[PDB]
Design a protein around this ligand. Structure first.
Ligand code: CL
Ligand code: CL
Ligand code: CL
Ligand code: CL
Ligand code: NA
Ligand code: NA
Lengths: 365, 365
């Protein structure tokens, strides 16, 4: 096995006369690694007129060419430009030296059309796919984040977004990252673009096409459900909150799924469970692990905060930031405290940091 | 307005140092009606060799012809047969006298292919659609209910299933009904088929294309989310359980959406909300409305029961039946007690009754 999937629950017991709240932390920990093989990267680059400004398009294309070069052989990569429609600059093996040159295209930024078309290419595909989408401006087709809530991201596709400068729609870049279980990188300055893009490569991986299905009544907070991640190259941390029905029957919480072992190439089953038993009320109350509840609450608060910021509710958002700080300190977790302090009420920065904190396993550095 | 949307919560308050459970009942009550207009019925009829037996196909087709006749003018209806593939017998206006004759087709029952193809016809469509699917046998393409969990039912499509006899896969007929916010009718005997099919018509309706979106952290138990129902002709009852994050900020639960008023044809916004405030723990505890919690718990238990039955876990299922009885009596609700007593541990009967009890607003009589 190349990963270990662990379950940590706030309770082993449930009330008998009313529903019981449960907080769950699931971690997928890579335990051994192999060279990346058989996956497909897609880089989608805005080719609107704004990107022509100040060599942005050139910075983006030279960086895309580097990524093509640097991804180890044995994988596949497509490079698309989009404006009015999508155009293919390269589709072929990784590890090649190629010159990507810009081409003339139409006006407009039909982002929804572009991402829809690319997602459709991978419907029902077994190939692990990472899509990286870069833009410096607002879409002109579907202009609001709510327009993207219906997007259907196929199994085994991840979507990562990079927003450049101050003029793009961060709510849209966030929801895309959320729907695709990726990260939304805000980068104020084009000087950071090459590193952000080239760092998206992975040389070593533990698992492909990981799926985690949760039993009924359990709601994952930080990833779309079912949890599906095409490439596991570092810890994947999943936080959920749920509700257990009353009565006297034992109730089994289940996390089930599968993944492809990167060393053997075998498809391995995931089956982790916890049996919740029943007890008198005072015994149930005394058994709750408040440290688990507090850690999960942080992510509930963070989700709320992300939504406030995306909705422009700035004062309430700052109040919640104060609470996130309190909640993070309550956990005594250090990564988390530092991450929380990066929330500076700049909505581009904040929504990007929300995705990074929610899905650390999706970050590439 | 032709409907009234009401919210009933188990709490007005939330704890400040930990998450709070909330049970919510949302009802959409029709308040005035108009003649059904502008919708599209689809009847899909299994045309495998088993259906040729004992005039089943003939009973089904004569009944489909009656439904074509009886649906009032101003609507549209498609009649498909499926086995190896789908074939169209009729596509046209309602209110017509047509003879539907069987035709020779291939062997096999490619149910997943058939439903996929029909659903695709209505991707991105604004037309309210009711699909009624009849079968007397097991699919031969995708043979397990888990194979249907990924089905994408478009907005404004409802899927109703009718299982005939003892040889079809009830778990599949159930999941299809669940994914399409419909009802799964088990009918042991072909003599009941004509009534079950013809009764699917509605003469009078209050709303079309109703959508209910729930704010973060709220999980609807008895319908797929977002809740979307193409035709409202009787009360729609929605039960949800959720979890509120800690802290001191007011937290607004929201049910938002829209529908088309059947009298004016205008598209009307739904916006219902409840502000949850904070209080000391003892005050929060004292404020919970246990009658709301108990009623929602019934549906949590019923969902669990449905899953046990679909998984063949028969002893545990009978234990849960006993608890459902207790839970239903705890509510003192009469419809509910009688419905619970119809659960007889025959899995075809039981899974059908689960869908009927979950979605009474989807039942047609
Ligand atoms: Cl080369
Ligand atoms: Cl207490
Ligand atoms: Cl006629
Ligand atoms: Cl107490
Ligand atoms: Na900014
Ligand atoms: Na039976």
């Amino acid at each position: 096995a190349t990963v270990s999937v662990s379950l940590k629950s706030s309770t082993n017991l449930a009330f008998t006369g009313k529903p019981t709240q449960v907080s769950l932390i699931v971690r997928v920990s890579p335990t051994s690694f192999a060279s990346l093989s058989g996956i497909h990267y897609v880089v989608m680059i805005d080719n609107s007129p704004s990107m022509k400004k100040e060599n942005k398009i050139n910075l983006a294309l030279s960086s895309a060419s580097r990524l093509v070069q640097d991804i180890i052989p044995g994988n596949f990569i497509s490079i698309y430009l989009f404006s009015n429609d999508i155009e293919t600059l390269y589709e072929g093996e990784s590890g090649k030296q190629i010159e990507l040159k810009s081409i003339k295209m139409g006006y407009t930024t039909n982002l929804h059309k572009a991402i829809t078309k690319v997602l459709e290419k991978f419907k029902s595909s077994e190939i692990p796919v990472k899509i990286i989408l870069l833009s410096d401006g607002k879409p002109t087709d579907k202009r609001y984040s709510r327009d993207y809530e219906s997007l259907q991201v196929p199994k085994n596709v991840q979507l990562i977004t990079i927003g450049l400068g101050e003029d793009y729609n961060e709510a849209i870049m966030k929801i895309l990252a959320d729907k695709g279980s990726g990260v939304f990188y805000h980068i104020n300055d084009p000087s950071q673009l090459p590193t952000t893009l080239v760092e998206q490569k992975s040389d070593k991986v533990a698992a492909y096409n990981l799926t985690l299905n949760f039993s009924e009544g359990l709601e994952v907070i930080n990833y779309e459900m079912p949890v599906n991640i095409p490439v596991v190259d570092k810890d994947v941390n999943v936080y959920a909150v749920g509700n257990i029905p009353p009565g006297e029957t034992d109730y089994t919480l289940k996390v089930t799924g599968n993944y492809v072992d990167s060393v053997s190439n075998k498809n391995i089953e995931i089956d982790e469970s916890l049996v919740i038993k029943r007890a008198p009320d005072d015994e149930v109350r005394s058994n709750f692990d408040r440290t688990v509840i507090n850690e999960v609450s942080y992510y509930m608060l963070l989700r709320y905060y992300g939504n406030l910021i995306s909705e422009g509710k700035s004062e309430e958002a700052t109040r919640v930031v104060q609470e996130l700080l309190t909640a993070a300190e309550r956990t005594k977790r250090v990564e988390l405290i530092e991450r929380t302090k990066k929330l500076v009420n700049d909505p581009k920065v904040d929504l990007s940091e929300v995705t990074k904190t929610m899905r650390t396993g999706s970050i590439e550095g």
